[PDB]
Amino acid sequence: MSINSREVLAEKVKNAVNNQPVTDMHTHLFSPNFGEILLWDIDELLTYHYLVAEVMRWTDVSIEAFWAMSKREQADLIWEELFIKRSPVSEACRGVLTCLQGLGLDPATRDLQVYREYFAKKTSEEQVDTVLQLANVSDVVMTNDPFDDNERISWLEGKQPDSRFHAALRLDPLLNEYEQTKHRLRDWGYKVNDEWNEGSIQEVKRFLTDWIERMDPVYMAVSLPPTFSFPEESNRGRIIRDCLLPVAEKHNIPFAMMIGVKKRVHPALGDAGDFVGKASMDGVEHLLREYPNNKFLVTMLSRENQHELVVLARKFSNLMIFGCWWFMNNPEIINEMTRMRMEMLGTSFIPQHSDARVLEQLIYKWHHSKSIIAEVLIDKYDDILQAGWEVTEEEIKRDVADLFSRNFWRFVG
């Protein structure tokens, strides 16, 4: 038959959404065999940079003093300032609670000591199994930076990630800081010249090719400022034009662009010091139109870029938009973004990614987003149901699978 009641439909959508294994196509997590770079712990959750920014709006403790404290002390301060002295109603604070509850811990007691004991008696491998199970995440895409001495080592040592973890080649240093990076390249055997000649071009391409072969990335990525433009006679513009795009096309690897971040407007805050700005769509429009054989994954930081980004996706099939990034990762914005996207793109987009920096975040990141996405799906199905259309649970499971996993794998080939 078909679904005949609004209740069955809802039960059906929520169940399908909750049961669908998720492919988180963009995170800052690492296969557990990569070592300490994989962050997890209630102390890591509480010291997430989102919460550092928030605690600094309340506490009288200087930023210097904060950075001087131990992670445990920072966590204690954040807990006291954001959870005890004021209700933890922000999205980031709410998330910490969702993680605790999901792990079987009880937020009702506010017993941070007891919460810590839970983690003290587990290994990274165990927690990963636990979390991926609780968050129903089957595949995690990492952010792998070959310019980070730490991460760099494991890749050179031939270490391969857990089969549940996939690599993504981060190129920010190369594209945004070529002047300083070119020195490290030549130091690694990549003889780039001071002038952008065929020699420099071939060496940069070799660097990319070497790492593509080494990581077997699902895509190459870069985060860009509000002022991003293309074409552009700059190191970034030339590298993208002469090296990145050609290589990406040859290996049929998508180019992921996270646009709109204004770095370090408040240096002292570190990762919590980045701001946002609306970008022009001209550069993305040009890339999509002039490079029809290249695939692009895009997410933008400014609320004001979201609707036009959806419209751009209507224009180019070689564009796949994804997630509600950072400052967009808040219920009010996730909801409006997801509705605009489905209304203009049907199911041809990737609703969300976690951008998790701490393992446990996969729990709240996906739990918070799934309930909103389910609500949107229920309304959209109810609307065509009202129009006389019949939908089957199989069709819903199909649609949900496309949104949470298939659209991505299908796009990166």
Picked from a second copy, Zn ion, none, the partner binding residue 151 (CB below 5 to 8 A depending on kind) is none
Report how far residue 261's alpha carbon sits from residue 227's, in angstroms, rounded to the nearest whole number. Answer: 9
Nearest to 273 by CA among 60, 66, 5, 69: 66
Contact with a second copy (CB under 8 A) among 303, 357, 375, 393: 303
Residues from 249 through 278 that contact a second copy (CB under 8 A): 265-266, 269, 272-278
Residue 367 annotated in ligand binding: no
Pick out residues in 334-363 that bind a second copy (CB under 8 A).
336, 339-340, 342-348
Question: Residue 79 and residue 74: Cα distance in Å, rounded?
Answer: 9
Cβ distance to a second copy smaller for residue 156 or 384: 384
Give me the residue label for tokens 């050179």: 156
Outline where DSSP puts E strands in 72-210.
137-141, 165-166, 169-170
Nearest approach, Cβ of 199 to Zn ion (angstroms)?
A: 33
How wide is the angle at C-alpha 382 spanned by C-alphas 3 and 17, nearest 5°? 75
* Binder among 8, 65, 68, 311 for a second copy (CB under 8 A): 311
345: its two tokens = 């793109």
Known binding residue 379? Answer is: no
Residue 401 touches a second copy, criterion: CB under 8 A? no
Of 87, 82, 40, which is closest to residue 61 (Cα–Cα)?
82
> Which residues 6+ apart lie within 8 Å of 136 measured at CB?
18, 19, 20, 21, 22, 366
Q: Which does 388 bind (CB under 5 to 8 A by kind): Zn ion, a second copy, none?
A: a second copy
Specify the amino acid at residue 291. Y
Please, what is the end-to-end C-alpha distance for the chain in angstroms? 34
- Asked if residue 36 belongs to a known ligand binding site, the reply is no
Counts for the chain of helices (H) and strands (E), in that order: 20, 10
In the numeric block, the tokens 């409006």 are attached to 336
Residues 176-205 interacting with a second copy (rule: CB under 8 A): none
Q: Is 26 annotated as a binding residue?
A: yes
Residue 10 contact, options a second copy, Zn ion, none, Cβ 5-8 Å cut-off depending on partner type: none
Cβ within 8 Å of residue 55, ≥6 positions away: 66, 77, 78, 81, 82
Instruction: Please state whether beta strands 137-141 and 165-166 pair in parallel, antiparallel, or not at all (unpaired).
Output: parallel
134 lines the binding site for a second copy (CB under 8 A): no
Measured from the CB atom, the residue of 71 and 289 that comes closer to a second copy is 289
* Residue 390, burial from CB neighbour count under 10 angstroms (0-12, 13-18, 19+): exposed
The residue within the footprint of a second copy, chosen from 35, 307, 375, 393 (CB under 8 A), is 307
Interface with a second copy, residue 384, by CB under 8 A: yes
Q: Which stretch binds a second copy (CB under 8 A): 35-43, 134-142, 148-156, 280-288?
A: 280-288
Structure tokens at 97: 């609670």
CB of 59 to a second copy, least distance (A): 8
Rule CB under 8 A: choose which of 327, 357, 375, 393 binds a second copy. Answer: 327
Q: Which is nearer to Zn ion, 200 or 338 (CB)?
A: 338
Residue 256: strand pairing partners: 221, 297
CB-based burial, 56-81: b 16+ in 10 Å, e otherwise: beebebebeebeeeeeeebbebbbeb
What residues are paired with 170 via a beta bridge? Answer: 221
402: contact with Zn ion by CB under 5 A: no
Q: Which stretch binds a second copy (CB under 8 A): 71-79, 133-141, 172-180, 323-331?
A: 323-331
How many chain residues touch a second copy (CB under 8 A)? 80
Chain residues 95-124 in contact with a second copy, contact rule CB under 8 A: 97-98, 100-101, 106-108, 110
Name the segment binding a second copy (CB under 8 A); options: 29-37, 111-119, 173-181, 281-289. Answer: 281-289
Tell me the β-bridge partners of 220. Answer: 169, 255
Question: Does 355 interact with Zn ion (rule: CB under 5 A)?
Answer: yes
Q: Which does 355 bind (CB under 5 to 8 A by kind): Zn ion, a second copy, none?
A: Zn ion
Q: Does 274 bind Zn ion (CB under 5 A)?
A: no
Contact footprint for Zn ion (CB under 5 A): 336, 355
Residue list, annotated binding site = 26, 28, 332, 355
